[PDB]
Paper text:
Based on this observation and careful analysis of secondary structure predictions, a construct truncating the protein at His100 (mouse [name] tailless [mS100A7ΔC]) was prepared and used for subsequent crystallization trials. Crystallization trials performed on mS100A7ΔC yielded diffracting crystals in the presence of Ca2+, and the structure could be refined to 1.69 Å resolution. The crystal was orthorhombic, in space group P212121, and contained one homodimer per asymmetric unit. The structure of mS100A7 revealed the canonical S100 protein dimeric architecture; each protomer is organized into two EF-hands with the hydrophobic core integrated across the dimer interface. Like all Ca2+-loaded full-length S100 proteins, mS100A7 occupies an open conformation with HIII shifted out from the core exposing a hydrophobic cleft. The Ca2+ ion is coordinated in a canonical pentagonal bipyramidal geometry by the backbone carbonyl oxygen atoms of Ala21, Glu24, Asp26, and Thr29, plus the critical, highly conserved bidentate carboxylate of Glu34 and a structural water molecule stabilized by an H-bond to Thr29 Oγ1. The Ca2+ ion is coordinated by side chain oxygen atoms of Asp66, Asn68, and Asp70, plus the backbone carbonyl oxygen of Gln72, the critical, highly conserved bidentate Glu77, and a water molecule stabilized by a bifurcated H-bond with Asp70 Oδ and Cys74 SH. The two symmetrically disposed canonical Zn2+ binding sites at the dimer interface, composed of the side chains of His18 and Glu28 from one chain and His 90 and His94 from the other, are all visible in the structure. Nevertheless, the overall geometry of these sites is set up for tetrahedral coordination, and in fact, a Na+ ion is found in both sites. The most significant difference between the two protein structures is due to mS100A7 having a standard N-terminal S100-specific Ca2+-binding loop (Ala21-Glu34), whereas this loop in hS100A7 is truncated to 12 residues (Tyr19-Ser30).
Author numbering:
A (entry chain B): 3 to 95
B (entry chain A): 2 to 99
Write the structure that this text describes.
């Protein structure tokens, strides 16, 4: 695999690792998303301070397009887009 | 150090920037830059059926180029990254099944 292929599989592995903990094994609850972010993107999460929990709930509701209170793989793309853009702003600054 | 996922995000960003720097705007992809990015970076994706054919790469570029300026900026590239991650998600499932 190329380094980018290794990167895509790492992201997919990540999603499944957290989604499998509770409820539907293919979807993230808010708590599964919270664990995924705190463990996987700490540089980003560390920057948010007091309003971290407010940010995670806003991100989750924005991603949960069908309002069923869980993130499927397709809805997770929304979160990946936000993470990629945040790390992009870091890649520069 | 950075987590595996953080390393993954930086790899994706680095890849975009490497190809976008070749010609024209150094922060956007020409069709020729996108084509090289895909064939070099995601060969398993490009191996699928007809994705190596001009038709597929030209239609993916057209779909991604939302403002019709004949280049893919970083925000438009997220469209392509979503398509790639969804295809590699099927490959992840086929590998688990084998
Ligand atoms: Ca779950
Ligand atoms: Ca949902
Ligand atoms: Ca360019
Ligand atoms: Ca464009
Ligand atoms: Na899956
Ligand atoms: Na950039």
């Amino acid at each position: 695999d190329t380094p980018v292929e290794d990167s895509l599989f790492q992201i997919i592995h990540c999603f499944h690792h957290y989604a499998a903990r509770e409820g539907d094994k293919e979807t993230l609850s808010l708590e599964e998303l919270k664990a995924l972010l705190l463990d996987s993107v700490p540089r980003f999460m560390d920057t948010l301070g007091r309003r971290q929990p407010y940010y995670i709930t806003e991100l989750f509701r924005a991603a949960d397009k069908n309002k069923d209170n869980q993130i499927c793989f397709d809805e997770f793309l929304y979160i990946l887009g936000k993470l990629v853009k945040d790390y992009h702003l870091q890649f520069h600054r």
